Amino acid sequence: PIATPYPVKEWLQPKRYKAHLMGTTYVYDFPELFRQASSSQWKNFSADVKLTDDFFISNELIEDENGELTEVEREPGANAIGMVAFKITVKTPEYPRGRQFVVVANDITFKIGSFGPQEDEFFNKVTEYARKRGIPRIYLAANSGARIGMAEEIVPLFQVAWNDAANPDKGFQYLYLTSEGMETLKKFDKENSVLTERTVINGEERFVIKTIIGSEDGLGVECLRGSGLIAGATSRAYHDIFTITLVTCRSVGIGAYLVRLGQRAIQVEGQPIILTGAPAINKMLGREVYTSNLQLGGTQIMYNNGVSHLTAVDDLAGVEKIVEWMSYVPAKRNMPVPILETKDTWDRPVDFTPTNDETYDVRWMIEGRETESGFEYGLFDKGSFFETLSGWAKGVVVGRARLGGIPLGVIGVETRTVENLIPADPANPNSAETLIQEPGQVWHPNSAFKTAQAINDFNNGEQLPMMILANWRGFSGNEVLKYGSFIVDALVDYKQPIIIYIPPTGELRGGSWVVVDPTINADQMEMYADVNARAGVLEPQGMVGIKFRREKLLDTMNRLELLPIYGQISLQFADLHDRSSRMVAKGVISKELEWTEARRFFFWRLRRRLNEEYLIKRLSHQVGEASRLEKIARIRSWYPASVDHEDDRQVATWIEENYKTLDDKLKGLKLESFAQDLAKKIRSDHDNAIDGLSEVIK
Amino acid sequence: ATPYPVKEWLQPKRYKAHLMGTTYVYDFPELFRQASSSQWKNFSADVKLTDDFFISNELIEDENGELTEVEREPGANAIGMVAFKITVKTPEYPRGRQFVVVANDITFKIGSFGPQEDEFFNKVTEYARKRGIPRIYLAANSGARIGMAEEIVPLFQVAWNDAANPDKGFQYLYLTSEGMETLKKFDKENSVLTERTVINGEERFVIKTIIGSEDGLGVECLRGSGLIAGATSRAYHDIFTITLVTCRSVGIGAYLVRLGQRAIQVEGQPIILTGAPAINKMLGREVYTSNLQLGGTQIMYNNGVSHLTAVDDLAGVEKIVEWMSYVPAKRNMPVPILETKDTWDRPVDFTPTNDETYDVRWMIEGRETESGFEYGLFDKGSFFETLSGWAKGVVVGRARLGGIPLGVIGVETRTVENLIPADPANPNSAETLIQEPGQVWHPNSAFKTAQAINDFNNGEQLPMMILANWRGFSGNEVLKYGSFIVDALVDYKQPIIIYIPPTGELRGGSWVVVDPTINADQMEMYADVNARAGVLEPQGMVGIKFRREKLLDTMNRELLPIYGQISLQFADLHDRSSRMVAKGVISKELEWTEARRFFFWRLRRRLNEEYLIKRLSHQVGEASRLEKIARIRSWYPASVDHEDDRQVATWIEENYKTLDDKLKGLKLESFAQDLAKKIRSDHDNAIDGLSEVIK
Ligand SMILES: C[C@@H](Oc1ccc(Oc2ccc(Cl)cc2Cl)cc1)C(=O)O
Ligand SMILES: C[C@@H](Oc1ccc(Oc2ccc(Cl)cc2Cl)cc1)C(=O)O
């Protein structure tokens, strides 16, 4: 454009234009998008808030001469490699004083954002940078995969020693180099560019090419090593810090791999996630099977399969989802989860209530429900429910929510039936659509997998507490065995409080109960049942057909056709066994609750548990054989005698008032152990031991 | 009576178990005795065993509920679950190895899991885990025990509506002042939760909840199921776990075979979540005739849940014992070395050729030929394949290298005819014959590969070799499972060897999932001189950096056909192991024929160095793995070539006890070095403790 109000950004830096032509945001413009999203964050939390410019800081990161990452301020487009990173520092509602994270991204304008050894090495450095600091790592993927290429400085030299020079059609023997060809290389210092041997044929002194290496780096296997390196780096990152990646422009090969390795992924519509391009897949098979890469890695495929947790209409939408997602996550590894009080106070009843009659959306029980006669509040803070993996295995609902300001992961069960449709396969004319009915409250391979993925995703990086509104009465698919197994493993590994709650009108039968029982992880799990909930190995019908058969159904029909009404009797006899009262009597749940009062009970129970967990975790690197079980008992023996250990609000309150003081008792607890240990060491090797102490003078 | 004197009280127990199609619980230890004896026979026919080579002591809880060995009469179990502590002398552990066998007693309440069975099982699992010994589970059960208050059955009343004739309906269930009292004389008064409600002269106790006096009716059984499901999950990561499905395994029973991962299914014995009769009552028509269509070996062995299949119980027990022969006697002990006739010093005979099909197993274990026997890479007769009925594109099993046990993963070059049967649940759907090309990763082969790596790593604690030979991938799913492989590599705690074999290739994404840098602490890459590797293969590489123009440009030498081959070659000259060495992506290129020799000493050397590193586990202070190996190697004599595997291994084995003395010194060093740093970080605190300690 000629003569515009302000400078033409796309002209000052043509790369910005090239990026837009690619249909994605120019890399150096992303920090700005995070500013806008953070600003929006505030505008939704408290509109009367006036942000200044120093509320958001973005410092590009590059490697210095020693290869160490350092902050710099240069002009966009100065990057010498196709990978860049920024260290962001933002003041946010949950972290007013500020929080940090790293943003690594491919520069789609630098060799089509390909991964070369330097890009790989940079990405690895940045990832390690974030991990050492316990800081989140955001990856913006816009690439073309591993960089490729041959040694061009060898194309105008290699000679072809044919069988008979006068018969090229008869084939050839091998490729060699002349004495002149060798001199060309020696002139460019590119001597060790190829491996060769000297052989004199019919007179001339030849140099057979054994192997072609190349002076240019990033031609083959070194790109593969680099890819393996960052793949491993990302696998580790996921277990260390919060990871998430946004696909803004295609993401290919190692690019797609990283998307999955970081687990949490948001896909912008139209930007495919592919291992290999459709063109390549065509040439291979036979004819033109696929018309677009969107048929291979498009949203309708990755979001539907669960690779993509969320979809975004554009780059800004994606960044906004990243930021909203981060608002439930600790500023950094091992910090308490970020409390964020909203207008919706903890002290209120739960309005929306399920009815054995009318069908409902679990989300209503979760986040509340908007109606004509007004809004009906749900179990968690209004507007705090952030659903993820919503395009996959809809039989189960997954997301983050807030309880009186306390963030946590929530897993619910969709009661309505799902109509998972699967498009035909382009690589087989003999195949049509396939509508699959997925019954509610039943566990299918996908539901189980999604359930396991959620637990692991709440646990790793996010380090959140969790509540599962357990309401399953079966399983039918036999891979289910494998994925169900993933659930137990996921729970065994959970490190923050877990709450399992069978809601009103809900039930948990046989296998369904098994996979979520508190004993799987007694260190963190507690189970509760609504007074209007049902639970048992078998449902009434099943129990009847085994313990109340026509045989005995007659004996009672005597002491008192009339089969139907007597069938309804047997059912009630059974159903009277599946009550929460029996659950309390048998000791399988911590408590039976009343739905309307659950928001109040859980807020304090969870708050109390988070406070206690925090004290326990202070004894992690304690010396000795002390068990978690013995650690809480000890800590709890500290509470004032007049404090009721079963009064959640009271225990939470006292702890919150004595942090510093408790740290002291904790410190003194480890000190006793360190001494008791040194004692047992001397009383197990007095010789070398005693001498050791002596070796310690000053 | 009978020819020989046998326990009379067992007859009916045995009969019932057999009626179920399984061996009687107490006769199982005998099968283990036979398999072990048979183990010695195959190893050294000229061996005479004394009964003391095998001991089996039943395990039961004492007064304090603690598990103790007992010498009691068989068939005396008061619960439907039993266990044995077995001590046996085996070829790999001549002085003896131990493990526990936990099993359902199919004759005790049809092998259902009740609270007591559950807690016992859990206690036995924990018993093994605390000792680091293998836990074998023999499944023969009916799932969670189920019940109902049978005492409330005879004495419960109905309160009908406007019906002196029930036909209309009822309002609730109640108890009479007498029935209520009946429970009082039986002491089963708290078997219900009622409310006093005198209506029409007569008082009725409304039934609000039925508890029952018999333990093990509902949810208490579910808690128990959850307890052992989790206990098994932990065991799998702690000790060697394996399960033999010797009869039906239902619900929690089925779940357990999975949770323990390694599983052997006896033919005709199904692993199911819920029976067929049950499923039919949830679909309308009679769709399933038998549970075998739900959990038979055709399902579970093909799906990957069952690692192996067995014709009968004893075959299963033999497979378990055979499997165990590759595993340490207990957690963290060195892998069991078992040298046989086939020693390490010999070249590898069998060699794959470009123009000829081959079974990767020939490369692994060797092949029988009319002229004799072509030895493969590993010890003749040592290959033990598992998960052979699922994802045939990848080959996994245990093997021995000059006596050293390890996990092996190879790539099936021949295509696979995957036949997926049609489920009766949908008549509209018939069977299909999926086509799986070799050297191509698919969702299932990727999944199987990750499982293999994790199963070699957890419990087995085995080193591993992957004869990487993949190119493309097709079947989305691939993405998720491919990532499982990386996670498994990252988690691997023993030496790993990635080796691209002769005629083998590794391209693009296939290289990245097995690159050494994923876990530099344990991985090493090797490429045969006749191997190939690059991002793309010649075909595609040319279709990007050598098109019509460049191809027609390099005419300084209309003959498209012949020149097309010249370009491909120009490319192929890049994919050489020599470049791989030049670029530094492999530790070195090797010659197939000498691989056995080379790998034997490299592994032996690595195993030795690992052991030395492990001795610095509890070493206080914080030193990186690379920091410990560096100091360990600084101890080698200055004349030892750190690159000479045999020499390094030889010196170490000659100095175990010496290195051990030096090893301790390095600990006591840090011991005080730590106390010092303590004071130099909290002087006040330290002094008080130092003083208080000196007393
Ligand atoms: C009460 C029930 O026990 C179980 C326990 C685990 C079961 O396995 C699963 C449970 C849940 C899921 Cl999602 C998957 C599986 Cl394989 C099935 C039944 C039984 O014994 O019948
Ligand atoms: C070199 C190659 O990089 C990769 C990396 C990972 C890839 O994804 C996988 C490869 C193998 C497996 Cl088993 C799984 C995945 Cl997800 C694909 C290509 C590329 O960039 O094309």
| Contact at CB, A517 and B222, closer than 8 angstroms | yes
| Contact at CB, A213 and B579, closer than 8 angstroms | yes
Q: Is A426 exposed, middle or buried (0-12, 13-18, 19+ CB in 10 A)?
A: middle
Q: How far is it, in rounded angstroms, from Cα B533 to Cα B520?
A: 20
Tell me which residue of A145, A151, A173, A150 sits closest to A160, measured CA to CA: A173
Q: How far is it, in rounded angstroms, from Cα A295 to Cα A116?
A: 27
Do A256 and A31 meet the contact criterion of CB atoms below 8 Å apart?
no
- Locate tokens 């004197």: which residue? B5
> What residue ranges in A47-98 does DSSP mark as E strands?
56-63, 69-72, 83-90
Q: How far is it, in rounded angstroms, from Cα A386 to Cα A329?
A: 13
Q: Which residues make beta-bridge pairs with B206?
A: B174, B195
- H/E run at residue B174: strand B170-175
SS3 for A116-172 is CHHHHHHHHHHHHHHHHHCCCEEEEECCCCECCCCCHHHCCCCEEEECCCCCHHHCE
Kindly state the tokens that stand for B472.
């493309």
Q: How far is it, in rounded angstroms, from Cα A218 to Cα B585?
A: 12
Q: How far is it, in rounded angstroms, from Cα A326 to Cα A400?
A: 10
Kindly state the tokens that stand for A61.
């990161």
**In CATH, what class is A1-148+218-333?**
alpha beta
CA A229 distance to own-chain centroid: 20
Q: How far is it, in rounded angstroms, from Cα B459 to Cα B493?
A: 11
Is A250 annotated to bind a ligand? Reply is: yes
- Locate tokens 């490190």: which residue? A495
Tell me which residue of B670, B617, B689, B675 sits closest to A670, measured CA to CA: B689
Q: Which residues make beta-bridge pairs with B588?
A: B526
**In CATH, what class is A334-672?**
alpha beta
Tell me which residue of B611, B605, B603 sits closest to B660, measured CA to CA: B611
- Locate tokens 């003194």: which residue? A668
Q: How far is it, in rounded angstroms, from Cα B662 to Cα B672?
A: 16
Q: How far is it, in rounded angstroms, from Cα B321 to Cα B296?
A: 23
Do B144 and B221 meet the contact criterion of CB atoms below 8 Å apart?
yes
3-state secondary structure of A267: strand
Do B609 and B642 meet the contact criterion of CB atoms below 8 Å apart?
no
Do B348 and B597 meet the contact criterion of CB atoms below 8 Å apart?
no
Do B503 and B352 meet the contact criterion of CB atoms below 8 Å apart?
yes
Q: How far is it, in rounded angstroms, from Cα B556 to Cα B550?
A: 11
> What residue ranges in B286-355 does DSSP mark as E strands?
308-310
Q: Which residues make beta-bridge pairs with A311?
A: A267
Strands B394-401 and B384-385: antiparallel
Helix, strand, coil percentages, rounded to 5, for chain B: 40, 20, 40
Q: Is A80 exposed, middle or buried (0-12, 13-18, 19+ CB in 10 A)?
A: exposed
Q: What does CATH list as the number for B1-146+216-331?
A: 3.90.226.10
- H/E run at residue B527: strand B523-528
Cβ(B546) – ligand 2 distance below 6 Å: no
* Mutation choice for B interface testing from A230, A523, A563, A576 by most B CBs within 10 A: A576
Do A216 and A152 meet the contact criterion of CB atoms below 8 Å apart?
yes
Q: According to DSSP H, which parts of A468-597 are helical?
A: 480-492, 510-514, 540-547, 550-559, 563-575, 580-586
Q: How far is it, in rounded angstroms, from Cα A163 to Cα A153?
A: 26
What radius of gyration, in Å, describes the C-alpha atoms of chain B?
32
Q: Which of A236, A273, A479 sits opposite B490 (nearest CB)?
A: A236
Do A330 and A463 meet the contact criterion of CB atoms below 8 Å apart?
yes
Q: Which residues contact B271 (CB under 8 A, 6 or more apart)?
A: A481, B139, B245, B248, B249, B253, B254, B257, B263, B265, B295, B300, B305, B306
Tell me which residue of B28, B54, B25, B90 sits closest to B324, measured CA to CA: B90
Is B562 annotated to bind a ligand? Reply is: no
Positive or negative torsion for Cα B316, B322, B325, B326 = negative
Q: Which residues make beta-bridge pairs with A244?
A: A138
* Mutation choice for B interface testing from A121, A221, A538, A539 by most B CBs within 10 A: A221
Strands B523-528 and B416-420: unpaired
Kindly state the tokens that stand for A300.
């309708």
Question: Phi/psi of residue A89, each to 5°?
Answer: -135, 115
Work out the number of other CB atoms within 10 angstroms of the CB of residue A597: 11
Q: Which residues make beta-bridge pairs with A194?
A: A212
CA of B625: how far to CAs of A474, B613, B651, in Å?
47, 8, 21
Going by CA atoms, what residue is nearest to atom 10 of ligand 1?
A511
- Angle made by CA atoms A115, A121, A125, in degrees to the nearest 5: 130
The torsion of the CA quartet B167, B173, B178, B182, rounded to 10 degrees, works out to 120
Positive or negative torsion for Cα A659, A660, A664, A667 = positive
Q: How close is the Cα of A87 to the center of ligand 2, in Å?
A: 28
Q: How far is it, in rounded angstroms, from Cα A147 to Cα A676?
A: 59
- Locate tokens 């975004």: which residue? A312
In CATH terms, the fold of domain B150-215 is ClpP/crotonase fold (2.40.460)
Q: How close is the Cα of B507 to the center of ligand 2, in Å?
A: 9
Do A318 and A270 meet the contact criterion of CB atoms below 8 Å apart?
no
* Closest-lying ligand 2 atom to the alpha carbon of residue A145: 20
Q: Which residue of A has its CA nearest to B533?
A: A221
3-state secondary structure of A314: coil
Is A146 annotated to bind a ligand? Reply is: yes
Is B146 annotated to bind a ligand? Reply is: yes
Q: Which string of b and e fits A250-264 if b means at least 16 CB within 10 Å?
A: bbbbbbbbbbbbbbb
Going from N- to C-terminal start, the domains of chain A cover 1-148+218-333, 152-217, 334-672
What's the half-sphere exposure (Cβ side, CA atoms, 13 Å) at A650?
10
Q: Which residue of A has its CA nearest to B664?
A: A688
**In CATH, what class is A152-217?**
mainly beta
**Which of B470, B473, B476 for a ligand 2 pocket mutation test, highest count of atoms within 8 Å of Cβ?**
B473
Question: Phi/psi of residue A578, each to 5°?
Answer: -85, 30
- Locate tokens 């009080």: which residue? A341
**How far does the CA of residue A242 sit from the closest CA of chain B (Å)?**
17
Do A408 and A379 meet the contact criterion of CB atoms below 8 Å apart?
no
Strands B308-310 and B263-266: parallel
Strands A374-376 and A369-371: antiparallel
Q: How close is the Cα of B146 to the center of ligand 1, in Å?
A: 14
Q: Which of B148, B207, B545 sits opposite A574 (nearest CB)?
A: B148
| Contact at CB, B479 and A516, closer than 8 angstroms | no
- Locate tokens 């010093």: which residue? B345
Do A328 and A347 meet the contact criterion of CB atoms below 8 Å apart?
no
3-state secondary structure of A23: coil
3-state secondary structure of A63: strand
Question: Phi/psi of residue B39, each to 5°?
Answer: -75, -45
B chain contacts of residue A582, beta-carbon cutoff 8 Å: 209-211, 218-219
**How far does the CA of residue B352 sit from the closest CA of chain A (Å)?**
22
- H/E run at residue B159: strand B157-160
Kindly state the tokens that stand for B421.
């049967």
Q: How far is it, in rounded angstroms, from Cα B66 to Cα A435?
A: 55
Q: How close is the Cα of A302 to the center of ligand 2, in Å?
A: 16
What's the half-sphere exposure (Cβ side, CA atoms, 13 Å) at B636?
23
Q: Residue A75 carries which DSSP code?
A: -
Do A455 and A520 meet the contact criterion of CB atoms below 8 Å apart?
no
Tell me which residue of A485, A237, A423, A104 sits closest to B476, measured CA to CA: A423
Choose the CATH number for B332-669 among 3.90.226.10, 3.30.750.24, 3.40.50.300, 3.40.50.10190.
3.90.226.10
Concatenate the DSSP letters of all residues of B646-682 into one string. HHHHHHHHHHHHHHHHHHHHHHHHHHHHHHHHHHHHH
Residue B608 region by backbone torsions, left for phi larger than 0, else alpha for psi between -120 and 50, else beta: alpha
Tell me which residue of B566, B423, B599, B404 sits closest to B497, measured CA to CA: B599
* Mutation choice for A interface testing from B535, B575, B620, B622 by most A CBs within 10 A: B535
Q: How far is it, in rounded angstroms, from Cα B568 to Cα B546?
A: 9
3-state secondary structure of A217: coil
Number of helices (H), then strands (E), belonging to chain B: the values are 21, 27
Positive or negative torsion for Cα B289, B295, B299, B301 = negative
The amino acid that residue A490 corresponds to is A
Tell me which residue of A499, A432, A497, A442 sits closest to A473, measured CA to CA: A442
Q: How far is it, in rounded angstroms, from Cα B689 to Cα B695?
A: 10
* Mutation choice for B interface testing from A173, A224, A676 by most B CBs within 10 A: A224
The amino acid that residue A139 corresponds to is Y
Q: How far is it, in rounded angstroms, from Cα B83 to Cα B66?
A: 13
Q: According to DSSP H, which parts of B167-291 are helical?
A: 177-185, 219-238, 252-259, 276-280
Is B545 annotated to bind a ligand? Reply is: yes
Q: Which residues contact A461 (CB under 8 A, 6 or more apart)?
A: A136, A238, A239, A240, A241, A242, A243, A264, A329
Cβ(B663) – ligand 1 distance below 6 Å: no
In the sheet with A386-388, reading across from the earlier edge strand, the strands are: A386-388, A396-403, A406-413, A466-468, A498-502, A525-530, A591-593
A chain contacts of residue B168, beta-carbon cutoff 8 Å: 565
* Closest-lying ligand 2 atom to the alpha carbon of residue B446: 13
Strands A374-376 and A418-422: unpaired
Q: Which residues make beta-bridge pairs with B192?
A: B210
Do B325 and B336 meet the contact criterion of CB atoms below 8 Å apart?
yes
- Locate tokens 């040439």: which residue? A283
| Contact at CB, A515 and B156, closer than 8 angstroms | no
| Contact at CB, B574 and A169, closer than 8 angstroms | no
End-to-end CA distance of chain B: 74
Q: How far is it, in rounded angstroms, from Cα A676 to Cα A678?
A: 6
Do B452 and B394 meet the contact criterion of CB atoms below 8 Å apart?
yes
Q: Which residue of A has its CA nearest to B537?
A: A220
Do A513 and B226 meet the contact criterion of CB atoms below 8 Å apart?
yes
Q: Which of A150, A155, A692 sits opposite B574 (nearest CB)?
A: A150
| Contact at CB, B166 and A221, closer than 8 angstroms | no
Q: Which residues contact A633 (CB under 8 A, 6 or more apart)?
A: none
CA of B337: how far to CAs of B379, B400, B496, in Å?
12, 8, 17
Strands B67-70 and B54-61: antiparallel
Instruction: Let me know how long chain A is.
Output: 698
Q: How far is it, in rounded angstroms, from Cα A287 to Cα A297?
A: 20
* Experimental structure resolution, Å: 2.5
* Closest-lying ligand 2 atom to the alpha carbon of residue B483: 16
Tell me which residue of A477, A510, A514 sits closest to B294, measured CA to CA: A477
* Closest-lying ligand 1 atom to the alpha carbon of residue A478: 16
Domain pair A1-148+218-333 / A334-672, same fold: yes
Q: How far is it, in rounded angstroms, from Cα B407 to Cα A309?
A: 36
| Contact at CB, A150 and B571, closer than 8 angstroms | yes
Q: How far is it, in rounded angstroms, from Cα A243 to Cα B259?
A: 29
Cβ(A229) – ligand 2 distance below 6 Å: no
